[PDB]
């Protein structure tokens, strides 16, 4: 539903310049509880996203004040006072105010204790099945839920759904109703994702994610992700 549009696609800067990335949402993103869950992620090649700003203007633990979030209504902006080498990567904006949560297309900034373990990469053929695993560590597995985000070969991020780790009840975003299934082994503190009758469209890296909503942060902990390559 809610489309997050980022500007620009590419952002070339020189170490030291000011950087600004905007993001417009097709609809207001004020969750009914009065909180606007706009969030900014920085993703480096091969790794998973890093939550930077949440609730529009809040810096996540560890994030330097060179980063600041602002905005209201439908337009949001992420500013980097002085770009540093470690800031290089792709910045994604995201809204968790209305289901299903959604991510912007990303902006590539370039120059001129809790851990989740995911199973290894899978090479499959269309029609087969896969059961990716995600082992939660250093937190009560049954306390929080487990989310699953899909990242296509192009880089696009999509909410697959989540599963109640206490009721073993899954909930999927419409584009994952059909052939996707969530399960778990609280015994080994592991969440599973199984895809049946694989299709080329399924080739992507799937990450399991843990939220921290009671804190206002959505998707603060990500697994390294698992790559499912569906080759004919």
């Amino acid at each position: 539903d809610i489309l997050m549009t980022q500007t620009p696609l590419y952002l070339p800067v020189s170490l030291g310049d000011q950087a600004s990335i905007s993001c417009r949402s097709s609809q207001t993103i004020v969750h009914n509880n009065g909180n606007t869950y706009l969030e900014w992620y920085l993703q480096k090649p091969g790794q998973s996203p890093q939550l930077l700003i949440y609730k529009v203007s809040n810096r996540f633990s560890g994030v330097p004040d060179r980063f600041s979030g602002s905005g209201s209504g439908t337009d949001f902006t992420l500013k980097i006072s002085r770009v540093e080498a470690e800031d290089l990567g792709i910045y994604y904006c995201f809204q968790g105010s209305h289901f299903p949560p959604t991510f912007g297309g990303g902006t590539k900034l370039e120059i001129k204790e809790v851990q989740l373990q995911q199973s290894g990469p899978e090479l499959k053929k269309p029609g087969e099945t896969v059961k990716i695993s995600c082992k939660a560590t250093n937190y009560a597995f049954t306390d929080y839920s487990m989310h699953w985000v899909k990242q296509a070969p192009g880089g696009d991020l999509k909410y697959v759904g989540w599963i109640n780790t206490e009721t073993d009840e899954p909930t999927f975003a419409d584009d994952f109703k059909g052939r996707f299934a969530f399960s778990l082994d609280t015994s080994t503190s592991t969440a599973f994702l199984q895809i049946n009758n694989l299709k080329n469209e399924d080739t992507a890296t799937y990450f399991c994610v843990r939220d921290r909503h009671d804190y206002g942060e959505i998707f603060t902990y990500w697994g390294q992700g698992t790559t499912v390559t569906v080759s004919s």
């Binding site: 869950y37 968790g96 929080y144 109640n164 009721t167 939220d211």
Partner: peptide
């Protein structure tokens, strides 16, 4: 805490 929000 099991996600509510959505």
């Amino acid at each position: 805490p099991q996600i509510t929000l959505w």
